[PDB]
DNA sequence: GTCATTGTGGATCCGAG
DNA sequence: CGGATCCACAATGACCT
C-alpha cells in the first residue's frame, strides 16, 4: 500500500491550509482523506490564486499538528515533488517516493509538472465532486493515477521507486 | 602495400639501435627486413632492459643514415605510436599511419599497447624465431597483424587511415 | 603530444504553493 | 530552495624506448 499525499500551503516556504491523501492498493485508489487546516501564517495572494482557499475558509480549522496523526500508518508516502511536502509537513513515519523523479527517469525529457504529466499521459481518474485542480484531494487523485501509470509502465516496486527517489 | 616500421632505441629521446620492417600485401605479411644500428648516444639501462640490445652488439654497425634508404619504396609507413618512430627516425618518403590512434578510434577505453591489442583481438601470426618481444622485426609482425585486423574490421583505406592519423 | 576518460565550477532551468 | 543538466575546461594517464 502506498499513501499518496498532497498539501496546499500559504506559499513556497510553507504554512498548511489543506492536506489530503489516497491509498493505492492493488492498482486501485481507496481510503480518501482530506482536511482544511489553519495555517501558522498568512496565506499569500500568489498561493491563494492557485488553491483558492481563503482565510475565512480556514479560520476555525485545526492546526496541522492536530490533523497530521490521521495520516500516520503507511510505510510509503508518495508525492509529486516529495521534496516539497516532506519539507513543509511535520516529520512522517514512512519513506518518501517522488513521482516527479520517477516520471523524469521513466520518460527522459518529458514535461514533469503534475498536470502536464496527467495531460500527456492521457490519464483518466474519477475525481471527487466539488473540488478543482490545486485542491489537495483532487491533486491526490491525479498523482495516484500518475503513480499507477508509472507502476504498470515500469514494473517498479515500492522499493525500487524509493531507491530511484534517493 | 603498406610497410610496417619498428625502431628500438637508446631511450625515449631517440638514438637508434635497431630498425625493422614488414610489408602487408593482400592481407599477407611479406619481405621482412631488419638492421642493427650504431646509435648516436649511450643506450639507457631502462631501454636495454626492454630490447636487450647491448653496446657490443651495435659497436661496429652502420649509422641510421647508412641503413635507412633500404626502407624506401613504400607509399605508406605504419607504426604503433607512429609519432614516436617519426620523431626518432630520419625523414621517410611516404605517409604515416598510426595503429595506436586507429585502435583507440575503433576500440575506445581498451588498453592500447602493441601487445595488449594483439592479445585482446585474439590475433595469431607466424612470428620470427631467434627474437623476442621488443626486438624490432618481432614487433613488426605483431603490428602488421594488428593493422590487417584493423583493416578488416573497419574497412578503412590507406588514405583514410592516413587522414585519421593526421 | 594525442586522446579517452575523469572531474569541476558555472550558467541555466525546473518543480513545489 | 534543492536538483537536474549541459558546458567549457582542465587534469590524469598510457603510449613509444
Ligand atoms: Na503538491
Ligand atoms: Na496540489
Ligand atoms: Na615501437
Ligand atoms: Na618494439
Numbering used by the authors:
A (entry chain C), B (entry chain D): 1 to 166
What does the paper say about this structure?
ExoX is one of several redundant exonucleases involved in the mismatch repair system, UV repair, homologous recombination and the stabilization of tandem repeats in E. coli. Like TREX1/2, ExoX contains only an exonuclease domain; however, it can act on both ssDNA and dsDNA in a distributive manner and digests only one or two nucleotides per reaction cycle. To elucidate the mechanism by which dsDNA is recognized and processed by single-domain DnaQ members, such as ExoX and TREX1/2, we determined the structures of ExoX in complex with three distinct dsDNA substrates: 3′ overhanging duplex DNA, a 12 bp blunt-ended dsDNA and 5′ overhanging partially mismatched duplex DNA, referred to here as complexes I, II and III, respectively.
In each asymmetrical unit, two protein molecules (A and B) bind to the ends of a single dsDNA molecule, thus forming a dumbbell-like structure. In complex I, the 3′ overhang is bent at an angle of 70 degrees between the first two nucleotides and extends into the active site. Outside the active site, a substrate DNA strand-binding site, mainly composed of Lys111, Tyr112 and Asn114 in the α5–α6 loop, interacts with the sugar–phosphate backbone of the substrate strand. Moreover, Lys101 and Arg104 of α5 form a specific positively charged binding site for the complementary strand. Most of the residues formed electrostatic interactions or hydrogen bonds with the DNA sugar–phosphate backbone, while few displayed electrostatic interactions or hydrogen bonding with DNA bases, which is indicative of a non–sequence-specific DNA-binding site. Strong density peaks were observed at the two conserved metal-binding sites of the DnaQ family, A and B. The intact substrate observed in our structure suggest that the metals involved are unlikely to be active metals (such as Mn2+ or Mg2+), and are probably inactive metals (such as Ni2+ or Na+). The ion bound at site A (MeA) is penta-coordinated by the side-chain oxygen atoms of Asp6, Glu8 and Asp139, one solvent water molecule and an oxygen atom of the substrate phosphate group, while the ion bound at site B (MeB) is hexa-coordinated by the side-chain oxygen atom of Asp6, three solvent water molecules and two oxygen atoms of the substrate phosphate group. The coordination of the two metal ions in ExoX is similar to that of the other members of the DEDDh subfamily, suggesting a classical phosphodiester bond cleavage mechanism for ExoX.
